[PDB]
């Protein structure tokens, strides 16, 4: 039962926590004169008392109360730290040598993959490559700023690691240290951080999250400098190798220093100014991509925004520090307005960082993150929201009618386009004469034939129930690892018992005895697991009866803004949303002389929640309720929120509760608590508001006589406007476009004001033609990525639970792959990933929190084993080789070589084996441009022999293949986290008070055995068909819930109401990690007839390994050759007319950052052909349609089953509730013959893109005529196992890679396949029977997760 | 032109119906829901009617 | 057939009066009541009547002249300056603009005195 | 035929009266209110009959679709 | 013909009158009218139950 703290900022830095702690320590207002300090000094916390009562804390307080030391805000010390240059000669030497060693090791590790790639492409000490020899010669001496950032990160990380280890060992540990960081004195604790600087006589009291943020800032700046230095060295070596952006380290260091100075002069509020940096950057971009009028307007609005933000920050800080203990801390440069100098210089630096280049100005978006996160105040933020959410809005009845009519018109248009029918109106008499003709003929007028009169007429239509409300609640949508607000009467339980008065505590203790345990849960998963009165149709009964209206328990809780509501009001909040996601977004597909003039308007929609009132949202949500037949399900918000008491329920931000006040509705309104919130809460009903915005844009297009195109990507929308105009004499295109933009701006401002959304000029801006959706920059068909922004947080234990090793390596590889896929640099991403992998494995492994050096001892065992096995020179070479072995066998390299040439593959084992072959060619001196043969060095022979010869221990083959159709078995693969914890999760869930979960957990093992026994008799095992069988049974839902639960920390304490990790889970995870680490010594025993490479096909070898592992006679449909091995690469004229030809249509030698003529290569997966039978498809819910599709897929793939009739009768009677012949009328009829490459399940890649940005694919043209003719001659119109899309993607990506490594893009490449690697694939006849009794048992045991049955009336209405 | 006048009158009546319906929808606000009279302006729909019919057995 | 035409014209005049009254109807949101103890109904009125109600602060709002200009179909100052042919520079942004232009390392910045 | 037009005109006059009374009522107190929101006709069963008719039509449709069983 | 349009106008006027009555008496302020509407709806629900189950 230990406590493990975070290593990265996984939450928010708290203003209230810092205020309370610093106000208790120093006995006076610290950051703000709110109620937090009053209650934190009147009634302190135990953790705060423990922090204050230390000897060093008492010494510091005694120093301050005299006072020799001065109190400062956390940002002062952030600025002080990030410039700490007080490094002695010994420390300088130590850090320089450590960084040199890390760089050398990473380059040595990367040399293996570079040699493999260069040997495959034929582009011809511990470094055998001349390229990386030169790179190391360049990289011998690190720069001073990089050493500074690395040293600072190392020291902060050492502090964090020491505290985390000694807190896992000893509970309540407080780390006091003044030696690691010279000058500073840290008192660090999971609930505080007191920093004292002696030489400057300064002191602050901040939180643990702020220390995590400082560590993250140091890591981010270290990563930026690492990437910049690597890229600059590569570019100096070759202008194509590194990233496209060319940066300057000195300038960037100056940017960090000046941003910290800004954050120091201004206090916390200084982040406001930083918040505007993108504005400047955006303006800079426009100065290359825009004309005079647009760019000048944007520049002026940018300057106005920046300076208004600065003035607001100054006013706020001066009004905030008025009566605190920081009143003397305000700089004299804030009072006299001298900051306007410093800020200017900062902006100048950004321009110097841009260097009038789109690449640098696009990459420069990391500046928001390297300066840390603001100490967010909660009371002030939600008061600012209240200001805009209590305002009365005045509406013109004509405007409301027009909006509702546009919504109804879009609904009708979607129905007619999709269902080829008008929704059945219940008062169709309204349609006067012509709309009646449109209704009877089932046609709709085009937008250009539409008038405002027509929309006002349409605004009067009422429909009949046209959609289905699911009776049985889906448990995959209402279950998550997120907190839940307590009920209203129990809301006081969100604040510490010390902070609440005596009467509140007595009331809480007397009310916890009146609420069921599920209510007092504080977490969603605990809310449902502890619900002993759960019903499958409680949600439907709530919606139908409208039990969420006028409910005394409704409350809204604002935390880090993230709002939540108690229990059932949450599930309704999802249910309504869910319905809009299925039944209504299909109608709104965009929610995911004689001169044509075009403009674009980008609007920040993150303020819709405040603007929308009932009178605007209801006019469309009522149409949605009418379509679904419910009364007020999509309008619940505005009929429920007004009557509730919105409260900020942060732990350290309690309200001032009056004398004898126990009810939240009678609490006096104040900062941190308000009522009568007329409007929407951000996040809830987001889909409805997006739909409403699209309807408004259609109405504006009608009112403006221009064609329109909307793209609403979440909280920001782009509107593309086109109008045909009679061009004036002398007028140019730019003036016409600008005039159109201004007129459309005025019109949409008028309309948005018409619905009471007073648009602000700071949010909306206009551009001629550039679109900046998906947070990416696109100029004339060229993509400029902010790749560096995503690889900032690449540290050792990133995105993991219990500091897992395999998962952290997976995350490191995935993150550092963005410098490859987006940034377009193989070598830069490779070296960055190797730097951080070496840091995680060689250095940070022996500093684990829970198993301090158990993993390092195991990794040393593995290295000794690999030295003995492969006959390596020493353990350095053993680590280098381990780092380049696939995680399927070993665990070093998380990114296989195929990922450098195409994203998706359908056979991981073959790619892993080919990667191993290529890697071991580094040591065996094997040529990769020739065939496989037996030579003197038999390291590869021994590896392959140990791969194929192993003792087979099959167990539960069929359930494992249903769960992971790519699984190996016989304990030949590394077990995953969900596999290990599945048994523990079931043992935890079996005792849950909820009968639905306990019953399904009690039968879990027996149902698994039965599920293994269903399809054991079919001889030619198809794992993907087994997956189809899996998803069509109710065990899939139970498995998904169990897998979701198994991903959390501290499974055992899930029902124990603790945040501590049980020792059982700690030990289990430790053993899992050790077994996974030693899997490499288990896979390759020292004493393992030798496989002969003469006429060896790795496809057959992988097929044999997969079959032998499960000891199955035949496994089909999961083995596909590796494209990177199959296709030899030629760069000269094809004298034999064989192989795919990829040619460069661009005329420039370098094709990076240039768009060509050809169409983009999306990957283009070929889908299946099916004749959908005609019936009223809207009568079936989404679950029923998915089940019907799955059963039809089974009927297509299992048409050869000897007892198909009984098997499908049982399946349809059990799941769908219909007989086989009744359900067969609804099954899609798959015209395609071959199901082994046209089946579509989640286990198959839906797309096969290249490892390059889409635009880049336009530079090249692919021709696959000769290989197609040869393959159709050899196989005669029969599907083979090699993926065509992956062949094309491999060709394109290797053209890009040869350009990178050669500096000259190839004129033409030819991919000549290896014929023996390609094998025919026909759909086989599935001889054998299906165990009907076992299938019935599987259906019955987990019947509680069965999808909705198709009732007799539903089938009748279905036709 | 009598039919033309009748058609114009019918279209104006249709506009009146649309405006009055939108006013009815927008006037059935949270005050009505607190009152419990929203279903008077909105009307019983398929779900509630089916639930009552099941209860009426 | 003059009497039928007269009847149709009378009906048309009544329809025109109804439509003219409806098209100018202003709907007020169902915001909080006075003293913030209770919730008010979604009251409706004529355009000028609701404008005068805003004038008599009878319906609490954070902005008045914007709502009046919108209802009167007028162009208030805020709308006029928000979307113009050019965006005027706030004086502080003016100073920042002279400082940004003419970059000559003469801004007289002293970081160590901070 | 003219009787139909006369009845239509009577209905339109009733509609004008209804709309003007609605606007006056929604205007609020202190302007045209002496009593506590005086009922201007008092017939609240008209919407009751209308809602009963609409619910009867919907129930009839549902029962007709169920009768196909 | 003329009679069809007259019937359509009659239906439209009936709809307008019904919705106008709903708006006019829905704007009632005092609690007496609110409680009367709620009890009338309860009685309507009971009558619907009885009329549905009469067969
Ligand atoms: C989605 O999951 C999978 C998919 C495919 C898979 C394989 N193929 C290719 C294909 O069979 C075909 C047939 C012919 C004939 C008919 C002999 O002329 C060809 F000539 C070529 C061809 C010609 C020139 C080239 F350069 C390259 C390929 N291609 C196709 F396209 F029909 F599907 N397409 N999909 C295989 C999988 C294997 C295991 C697990 N999943 C798989």
Q: Domain-by-domain residue ranges, chain E?
A: 2-55
Which of D54, D61, D66 is facing A1353, going by the closest CB pair? D66
Q: Which residues contact A200 (CB under 8 A, 6 or more apart)?
A: A80
Half-sphere exposure of A716 (CA within 13 A, CB side): 11
State the distance from the centre of ligand 1 to the C-alpha of A782, rounded, in angstroms: 32
Mutate to test the interface with A, among B9, B11, B23, B45 (most CBs of A within 10 A): B45
Contact check, Cβ <8 Å, D61/A464: yes
Q: Shortest CB distance from B13 goes to which of C8, C15, C27? A: C15
* Half-sphere exposure (Cβ direction) of A1101: Cα atoms closer than 13 Å: 26
Please judge whether A427 and E12 are an interchain contact, meaning their C-beta atoms are less than 8 angstroms apart: no
Q: Find out whether the beta carbon of A1287 lies less than 6 Å from any atom of ligand 1.
A: yes
CA atoms within a 13 Å half-sphere pointing along the CA-CB vector of A1222:
17
The DSSP annotation for A789-821 comes to: TTSTT--TT-S-STT-HHHHHHHHHHHHTHHHH
CB proximity B56 to E under 8 Å: yes
Quick check: D66 contacting A, CB < 8 Å? yes
Q: Is A698 annotated as a binding residue?
A: no
Question: In what helix (H) or strand (E) does residue E36 lie, and over which residues does it extend?
Answer: helix E31-53
Pocket residue to mutate for ligand 1, from A1100, A1234, A1284, most atoms within 8 A of Cβ: A1284
Experimental method used, please? cryo-EM
Q: Which atom of ligand 1 is nearest to the CA of A1279?
A: 11
CA D15 → CA A104, A401, D21, E18, distances in Å? 89, 19, 10, 10
Q: Would the CB of A1277 count as within 6 Å of ligand 1?
A: yes
CA atoms of A658 and A666, how far apart (whole Å): 9
Q: What whole-number distance in Å separates Cα of residue D10 and Cα of residue D16? A: 10
- Contact present, A957 and A1012 (Cβ < 8 Å): yes
Q: How many CB atoms lie within 10 A of CB C24?
A: 17
The number of beta carbons lying within 10 Å of the beta carbon of residue A537 is 12
Distance CA(A692)–CA(A710), nearest Å, equals 12
The rounded distance, in Å, linking the Cα atoms of A625 and A466 is 10
CB A1079 within 8 A of CB A892: no
For ligand 1, the distance from its centroid to the CA atom of residue A1282, given in whole angstroms, is: 5
If phi over 0 gives left and psi between -120 and 50 gives alpha, with beta otherwise, what is residue A1327?
beta
Closest by Cα among C40, C95, C48, C88 to A341: C95
Q: How many whole angstroms separate alpha carbon A109 and alpha carbon A107?
A: 5
Decide whether any atom of ligand 1 lies within 6 Å of the A1279 Cβ.
yes
Between the alpha carbon of residue B4 and those of residues A653, B25, C2, C3, E5, the distances in Å are: 69, 31, 16, 17, 11
Q: Give the distance from residue B57's alpha carbon to the nearest chain E alpha carbon, in angstroms.
A: 6
Rounded to the nearest whole angstrom, what is the distance from the C-alpha of residue A1279 to the centroid of ligand 1? 5
Q: Quick check: A305 and C87 in contact, CB under 8 A?
A: no
Resolution in A: 3.2
Q: Select the residue of E22, E34, E52 nearest B53 (Cβ to Cβ).
A: E52
A715 annotated among ligand-binding-site residues: yes
Tokens of residue A313, six digits: 């920050």
Hey, is A275 helix, strand or coil? helix
Give the C-alpha separation, E18 to A491, whole Å. Answer: 45
Q: Does D23 touch chain A (CB under 8 A)?
A: no
DSSP class of residue A670? B
Find the farthest-apart pair of alpha carbons in chain E and give their distance in angstroms, rounded. Answer: 49
Whether the Cβ atoms of residue A839 and residue A796 lie closer than 8 Å to each other:
yes
Protein residue closest via CA to atom 37 of ligand 1: A1281
- Asked if residues A276 and A305 have their Cβ atoms less than 8 Å apart, the reply is yes
Contacts of C28 in chain A (CB under 8 A): 392-395
SS3 state at A507 = helix
Q: Which of A1267, A1280, A1290, A1324 to mutate to test the pocket of ligand 1 (most atoms within 8 A of CB)?
A: A1280
Residue closest via CA to ligand 1's atom 29 equals: A1284
Which of C66, C71, C90 lies nearest to residue A304, judging by beta carbons? C90
Ligand 1 in contact with A1167 (CB < 6 A)? Answer: no
C-alpha atoms less than 13 angstroms from C-alpha of A1158 in its C-beta half-sphere: 18
Rounded Cα distance, C40 and A413, in Å: 37
Closest Cα partner for C76 from C65, C90, C88? C65
| Maximum C-alpha span of chain B | 56
- Does the distance separating the beta carbons of B31 and C30 come in below 8 Å? yes
Three-class SS of residue A646? strand
Strand partners, A597: A723
User: Residue A116 has which token pair?
Assistant: 């493999």
Q: Is A544 on the interface with E (CB under 8 A)?
A: no
Tokens representing A284 are 């800079």
CB atoms within 10 A of CB A659: 6
- Token pair for C17: 């009066």
Mutate to test the pocket of ligand 1, among A1282, A1291, A1318 (most ligand atoms within 8 A of CB): A1282
Shortest alpha-carbon distance between residue C68 and chain A (Å): 10
**Element holding A922 (H helix, E strand):** helix A908-924
Dihedral sign, Cα of residue C86, residue C87, residue C92, residue C97: negative
- CA-to-CA distance for A330 and A72, rounded, in angstroms? 10
CB contact under 8 A, E9 and D12: no
Task: State the best of E10, E16, E24 to mutate against chain D, taking most chain D CBs within 10 Å.
Answer: E24
Contact E49 B56 (CB under 8 A): yes
| Cross-strand pairs, A886 | A893
CA distance A1357 to chain D (A): 7
What 8-state DSSP symbol labels residue A843? I
By C-alpha distance, the chain B residue nearest D16 is B16
- Strand C44-46 vs strand A765-767: parallel, antiparallel, or unpaired? unpaired
Assess whether the C-beta atom of A1237 lies below 6 angstroms from ligand 1. Answer: yes
Alpha-carbon distance of A700 to A324, in angstroms, equals: 51
Ligand 1 atom with minimal separation from the A1238 CA: 1
CB distance C96–A344 less than 8 Å? yes
Q: Is residue A1123 within 6 Å of ligand 1 at its C-beta?
A: no
Do residue B50 and residue D63 have CB atoms under 8 angstroms apart? Answer: no
| Chain D CB contacts of B39 below 8 Å | 51
Q: What is the distance in A from the centroid of ligand 1 to the CA of A1031? A: 26
Q: Which two tokens stand for residue A1097?
A: 């096909």
Query: From B26, which residue of chain A is nearest by alpha-carbon distance?
Result: A615
Identify the residue among D1, D3, D5 best suited for mutation to test binding to C, counting C beta carbons within 10 A and taking the highest: D5
CA-to-CA distance for A1109 and A947, rounded, in angstroms?
Answer: 10
A1115 lines ligand 1 (CB under 6 A): no
Residues ≥6 apart with Cβ < 8 Å to A868: A1086
User: Among this protein's residues, is A1237 annotated catalytic?
Assistant: yes
Compute, in angstroms, the gap from residue A529 CA to the centroid of ligand 1. Answer: 47
Residues A475/A1041, Cβ–Cβ less than 8 Å: yes
* Cα distance between the two ends of chain C: 94
Peptide-bond breaks in chain A following residues (C–N over 2.5 A): 124, 560, 592, 1088
In B8-37, the residues whose Cβ lies within 8 Å of chain C are 8-9, 12-13, 15-16, 19-20, 23, 26-27, 29-31, 34
Out of D47, D48, D55, the one facing B49 most closely (by C-beta) is D55
Return phi, psi of residue E28, to 5°.
-70, 140
Which structure tokens are listed for A1182? 């989404």
Q: What is the SS3 string spanning A721-747?
A: EEEEECCCCCCCHHHHHHHHHHHHHHH
Specify the residue with its C-alpha closest to ligand 1, atom 32.
A1279
């Amino acid at each position: 039962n230990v406590y493990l703290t975070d290593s990265y900022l996984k939450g928010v830095i708290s203003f209230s926590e810092c205020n309370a702690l610093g106000s208790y320590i120093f006995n006076g207002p610290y950051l703000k004169n709110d109620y937090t300090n009053l209650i934190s000094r009147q009634n302190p916390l135990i953790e705060h008392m423990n922090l204050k009562k230390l000897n060093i804390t008492q010494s510091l307080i005694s120093k301050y109360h005299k006072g020799e030391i001065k109190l400062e805000e956390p940002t002062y010390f952030q600025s002080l730290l990030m410039t700490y240059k007080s490094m002695t000669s010994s420390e300088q030497i130590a850090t320089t040598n450590l960084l040199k060693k890390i760089i050398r090791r990473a380059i040595e590790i990367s040399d293996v993959k570079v040699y493999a790639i260069l040997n495959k492409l034929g582009l011809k000490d511990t470094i055998k490559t001349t390229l990386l020899k030169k790179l190391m010669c360049s990289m011998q001496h690190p720069p001073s700023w990089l050493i500074h950032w690395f040293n600072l990160y190392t020291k902060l990380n050492n502090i964090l690691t020491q505290y985390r280890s000694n807190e896992v060992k000893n509970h309540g540990f407080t780390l006091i240290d003044n030696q690691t960081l010279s000058g500073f004195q840290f008192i660090l604790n999971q609930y505080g951080c007191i920093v004292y600087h002696k030489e400057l006589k300064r002191i602050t009291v901040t939180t643990y999250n702020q220390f995590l943020t400082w560590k993250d800032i140091s890591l981010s700046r270290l990563n930026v400098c690492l990437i910049t230095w690597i890229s600059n060295c590569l570019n100096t070596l070759n202008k194509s190798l590194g990233l496209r952006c060319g940066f300057n380290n000195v300038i960037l260091t100056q940017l960090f220093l000046y941003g910290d100075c800004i954050l120091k002069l201004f206090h916390n509020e200084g982040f406001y100014i930083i918040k505007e940096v993108e504005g400047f950057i955006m303006s800079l971009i426009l100065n290359i991509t825009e004309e005079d009028q647009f760019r000048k307007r944007f520049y002026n609005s940018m300057l106005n925004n920046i300076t208004d933000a600065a003035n607001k920050a100054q006013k706020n800080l001066l009004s905030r520090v008025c009566h605190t203990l920081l009143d003397k801390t305000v700089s004299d440069n804030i009072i006299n307005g001298r900051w306007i100098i410093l800020l200017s210089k900062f902006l100048k630096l950004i321009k110097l960082a841009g260097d009038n280049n789109l690449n640098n100005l696009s990459e420069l978006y990391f500046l928001f993150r390297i300066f840390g996160h603001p100490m967010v105040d909660e009371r002030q933020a939600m008061d600012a929201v209240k200001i805009n959410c209590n305002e009365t809005k005045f509406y013109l009845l004509s405007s409301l009618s027009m909006l509702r009519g546009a919504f109804i018109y879009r609904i009708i248009k979607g129905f007619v386009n999709n269902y080829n029918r008008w929704p059945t109106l219940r008062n169709a008499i309204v349609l006067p004469l012509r709309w009646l003709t449109y209704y009877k003929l089932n046609t709709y007028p085009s937008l250009l034939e539409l008038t405002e009169r027509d929309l006002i007429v349409l605004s009067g239509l009422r429909f009949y129930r046209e959609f289905r409300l699911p009776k049985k609640v889906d448990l995959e949508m209402i279950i998550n690892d997120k907190a839940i607000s307590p009920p209203k009467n129990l809301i006081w339980t969100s604040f510490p018992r010390n902070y609440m008065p005596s009467h509140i505590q007595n009331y809480i203790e007397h009310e916890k005895l009146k609420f069921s345990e599920s209510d007092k849960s504080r977490r969603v998963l605990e809310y449902y697991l502890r619900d002993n009165k759960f019903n499958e149709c409680d949600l439907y009964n709530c919606v139908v009866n409208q039990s969420y209206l006028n409910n005394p328990n409704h409350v809204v809780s604002l935390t880090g803004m993230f709002a939540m509501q108690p229990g059932m009001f949450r599930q309704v909040q999802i249910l309504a949303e869910k319905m809009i996601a299925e039944n209504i977004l299909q109608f709104f597909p965009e929610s995911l002389n004689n001169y044509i003039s075009k403009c674009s308007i980008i609007t920040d929609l993150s303020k819709f929640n405040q603007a929308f009132r009932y009178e605007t949202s209801c006019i469309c949500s009522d149409v949605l309720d009418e379509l679904h037949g419910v009364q007020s399900l999509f309008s619940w918000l505005h009929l429920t929120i007004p009557h509730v008491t919105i409260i900020c329920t942060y732990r350290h931000a309690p309200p001032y509760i009056g004398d004898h006040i126990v009810d939240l509705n009678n609490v006096d309104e104040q900062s941190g608590l308000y009522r009568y919130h007329m409007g929407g809460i951000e996040g809830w009903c987001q889909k409805l508001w997006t739909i409403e915005a699209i309807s408004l844009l259609d109405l504006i297009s009608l009112k403006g006589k221009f064609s329109i195109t909307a793209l609403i990507n979440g909280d920001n929308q782009s509107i593309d406007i086109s109008k045909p105009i009679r061009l004036m004499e002398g007028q140019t295109h730019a003036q016409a476009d600008y005039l159109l933009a201004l007129n459309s701006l005025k019109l949409l401002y008028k309309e948005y004001a018409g619905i009471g959304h007073k648009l602000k000029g700071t949010e909306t801006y206009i551009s001629r033609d550039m679109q900046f959706m998906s947070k990416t920059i696109q100029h004339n068909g060229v993509y400029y990525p902010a790749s560096i922004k995503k690889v900032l947080r690449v540290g050792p234990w990133i995105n993991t639970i219990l500091d897992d090793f395999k998962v952290s390596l997976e995350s490191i590889g995935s993150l550092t792959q963005e410098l490859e896929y987006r940034g377009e640099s193989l070598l830069c991403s490779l070296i960055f990933r190797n730097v951080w992998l070496y840091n995680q494995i060689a250095l940070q492994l022996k500093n684990h929190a829970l198993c301090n050096n158990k993993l390092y001892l195991d990794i040393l065992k593995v290295l000794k084993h690999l030295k003995t096995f492969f006959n390596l020179d020493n353990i350095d070479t053993a680590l280098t080789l381990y780092m380049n072995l696939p995680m399927l066998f070993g665990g070093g390299d998380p990114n296989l070589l195929y990922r450098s040439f195409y994203r998706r593959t359908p056979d991981f084992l073959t790619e892993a084996i080919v990667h191993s072959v290529f890697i071991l060619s580094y040591y065996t001196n094997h040529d990769l441009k020739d065939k496989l043969q037996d030579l003197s060095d038999d390291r590869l022979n021994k590896f392959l022999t140990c791969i194929i010869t192993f003792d087979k221990n099959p167990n539960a083959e069929f359930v494992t293949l249903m769960r992971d159709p790519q699984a190996l078995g016989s304990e030949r693969q590394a077990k995953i986290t969900s596999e290990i914890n599945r048994l523990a999760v079931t043992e935890v869930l079996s005792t849950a008070p909820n009968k639905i979960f306990s019953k399904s957990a009690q039968h879990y093992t027996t149902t698994e055995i039965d599920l293994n026994d269903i399809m054991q008799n079919i001889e030619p095992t198809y794992p993907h068909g087994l997956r189809v069988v899996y998803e069509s049974l109710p065990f899939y839902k139970a498995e998904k819930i169990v897998n979701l639960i198994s991903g959390t920390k501290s499974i055992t304490n899930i029902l124990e109401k603790t945040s501590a990790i049980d020792l059982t889970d700690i030990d289990r995870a430790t053993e899992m990690m050790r077994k996974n680490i030693t899997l490499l010594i288990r896979i390759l025993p020292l004493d393992c007839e030798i496989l002969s490479m003469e006429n060896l096909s790795i496809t057959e070898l992988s097929k044999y390994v997969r079959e032998r592992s499960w000891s199955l006679s035949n496994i089909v449909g999961v083995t596909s050759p590796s494209i990177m091995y199959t296709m030899d690469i030629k760069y000269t004229t094809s004298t034999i007319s064989s192989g795919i030809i990829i040619e460069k249509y661009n005329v420039n030698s370098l094709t990076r950052g240039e768009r060509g003529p050809t169409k983009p290569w999306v990957g283009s997966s070929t889908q299946e052909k099916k004749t959908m039978p005609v019936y009223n498809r809207q009568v079936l819910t989404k679950k029923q349609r998915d089940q019907i599709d799955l059963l039809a897929k089974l009927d297509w793939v299992y048409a050869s089953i000897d007892n198909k009739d009984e098997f499908m009768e049982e399946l349809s009677i059990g799941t769908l509730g219909l007989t086989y012949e009744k359900a067969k009328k609804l099954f899609p009829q798959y015209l395609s013959v071959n199901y082994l490459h046209r089946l579509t399940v989640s286990s198959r890649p839906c797309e096969f893109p290249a490892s390059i940005p889409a635009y880049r694919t336009t530079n090249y043209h692919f021709d696959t005529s000769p290989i197609n003719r040869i393959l159709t001659e050899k196989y005669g119109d029969e599907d083979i196992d090699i993926v065509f899309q992956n062949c094309i993607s491999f060709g394109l990506s290797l053209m890009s890679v040869v350009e990178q490594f050669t500096n000259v893009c190839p004129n033409r490449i030819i991919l000549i396949p290896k014929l023996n690697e390609i094998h025919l694939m026909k759909p086989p006849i599935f001889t054998g029977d299906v165990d009907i009794h076992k299938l019935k048992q599987v259906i019955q045991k987990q019947h509680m997760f069965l999808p909705d049955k198709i009732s007799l009336t539903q089938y009748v209405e279905l036709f | 032109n009598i039919t033309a006048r009748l058609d114009r009158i019918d279209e104006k009546l249709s506009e009146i119906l649309g405006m009055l319906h939108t006013l009815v929808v927008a006037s059935a606000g949270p005050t009505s829901a607190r009152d419990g009279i929203r279903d008077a302006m909105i009307g019983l729909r398929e779900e509630m009617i089916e639930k009552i019919r099941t209860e009426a057995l």
